[PDB]
């Protein structure tokens, strides 16, 4: 289905990175938050769903099932939250390659997301993740 995402967290320099993956394309969006709160996840989901068809979000643990705001975001935007489900180390190599081009970690995280979404697999031919998600939604 064209609206399936995976949501996860990752950690770098004592900061928290929210990562959404569009499962069929590998497109990612990410955001650095001060702390891993309900509100932050709800805000991120609402932005995401305003940009793409988001039908179902898959997570790997219980954290998101206990936030009052995440459930009000789910419901407002029409997002099914489903339990049950790598990319998270591609990110980190690219973050390492750019880290000292940016003062702020968040900048490096977005430079990493950029390159993840724009590049071709193996550097030649076919579609980027950013091309594939557009191509998937367009049909």
Ligand X SMILES: Cc1ccc2oc(C#Cc3cccs3)c(CC(=O)O)c2c1
The residues of the shown chain that bind its own copies, judged by CB under 8 A, are 29, 43, 46-47, 49-52, 76-77, 101, 104, 106-107, 110-111, 113-114, 117-118, 130, 134-135, 137-138
Q: Taking a C-beta distance cutoff of 8 angstroms, is the pair 41, 70 a contact? A: yes
- Cβ-based nearer residue to its own copies, 56 or 107: 107
CA 101 from chain centre, in angstroms, equals 22
Provide the minimum distance between the beta carbon of 69 and ligand X in the complex, in angstroms, as a whole number. Answer: 5
Rule CB under 6 A: say whether 104 interacts with ligand X. yes
Tell me which residues in 35-64 interact with ligand X (CB under 6 A): 39-40, 42-43, 46
């Amino acid at each position: 289905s064209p609206g399936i995402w995976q949501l996860d967290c990752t950690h770098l320099e004592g900061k928290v990175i929210l990562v959404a993956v569009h499962v069929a394309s590998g497109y990612i969006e990410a955001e650095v938050i001060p702390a891993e709160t309900g509100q932050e996840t709800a805000y991120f989901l609402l932005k995401l769903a305003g940009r793409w068809p988001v039908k179902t979000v898959h997570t790997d643990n219980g954290s998101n099932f206990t936030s009052t705001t995440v459930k009000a975001a789910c419901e407002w935007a029409g997002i099914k939250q489903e339990f049950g489900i790598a990319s998270n180390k591609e990110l980190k190599k690219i973050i390492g390659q750019v880290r000292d081009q940016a003062e702020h970690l968040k900048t490096a995280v977005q430079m990493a997301v950029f390159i993840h979404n724009k590049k071709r697999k193996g550097g030649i031919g076919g579609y980027s993740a950013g091309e594939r998600i557009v191509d998937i939604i367009a049909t």
